[PDB]
Amino acid sequence: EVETFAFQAEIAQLMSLIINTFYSNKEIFLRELISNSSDALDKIRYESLTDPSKLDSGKELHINLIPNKQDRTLTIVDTGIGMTKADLINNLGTIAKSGTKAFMEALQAGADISMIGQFGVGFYSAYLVAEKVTVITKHNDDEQYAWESSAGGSFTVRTDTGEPMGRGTKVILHLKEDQTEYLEERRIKEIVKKHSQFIGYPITLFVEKE
Numbered sequence: 001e002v003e004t005f006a007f008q009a010e011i012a013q014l015m016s017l018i019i020n021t022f023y024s025n026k027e028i029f030l031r032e033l034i035s036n037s038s039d040a041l042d043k044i045r046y047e048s049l050t051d052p053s054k055l056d057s058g059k060e061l062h063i064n065l066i067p068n069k070q071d072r073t074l075t076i077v078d079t080g081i082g083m084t085k086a087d088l089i090n091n092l093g094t095i096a097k098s099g100t101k102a103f104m105e106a107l108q109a110g111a112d113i114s115m116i117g118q119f120g121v122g123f124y125s126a127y128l129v130a131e132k133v134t135v136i137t138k139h140n141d142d143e144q145y146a147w148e149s150s151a152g153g154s155f156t157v158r159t160d161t162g163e164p165m166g167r168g169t170k171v172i173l174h175l176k177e178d179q180t181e182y183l184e185e186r187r188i189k190e191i192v193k194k195h196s197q198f199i200g201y202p203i204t205l206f207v208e209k210e
């Protein structure tokens with residue numbers, strides 16, 4: 001069924017800082033998540049160079065952006081390497097304790113929240129715009145898992161019996177009520193063009209039934 005875990009104290013503090021700090025430039029969350037997708041896609045590509053069978057779970061390396069105004073969700077889907085259960089529990093495959101230290105040492109040496117990705121913890125920028133984040137992931141040779149957190153110091157992990165993914169990671173942002181601009185096609189397109197114009201994988205922005 002469902003396992004509930006406490007965030008490490010430093011990660012809880014990172015999340016509080018992101019949620020509570022007054023900071024208007026919230027759109028960098030999308031750059032940060034697309035960058036994490038690109039890094040995951042680079043990892044499966046590198047493994048495939050010496051073991052082509054690594055791509056038996058899907059040959060196409062890409063990123064989909066899926067807005068849903070009914071559900072108030074923005075979903076970022078990649079076909080990258082995915083995460084094991086251990087990776088999910090260990091801060092979504094990050095060195096988040098040491099990265100959070102460096103980041104907060106930078107925020108005192110002048111830096112701003114937009115530089116979060118330089119510290120390896122850009123996933124947590126999702127909480128600039130999301131009240132809840134759900135991560136569905138599938139790594140070769142492991143099962144499909146669902147991570148979830150509304151912050152407040154805990155996350156859950158369960159085996160996902162939802163729609164099978166093949167391989168990769170899906171980040172489902174349940175947007176805050178005042179952050180629905182990130183479901184509008186023109187706003188998403190503007191952000192991708194501004195901050196993600198050189199990413200080396202196709203980024204397909206899905207459209208909705210009007």
Ligand SMILES: NC(=O)c1ccc(O)cc1O
Pocket residue numbers: 033036037040078080081082083092093123137168169171
């Ligand atoms: N390593 C991963 O699978 C991964 C983690 C976080 C994220 O936002 C995207 C990802 O592909």
Ligand SMILES: [Cl-]
Pocket residue numbers: 094095096097098099
């Ligand atoms: Cl660490």
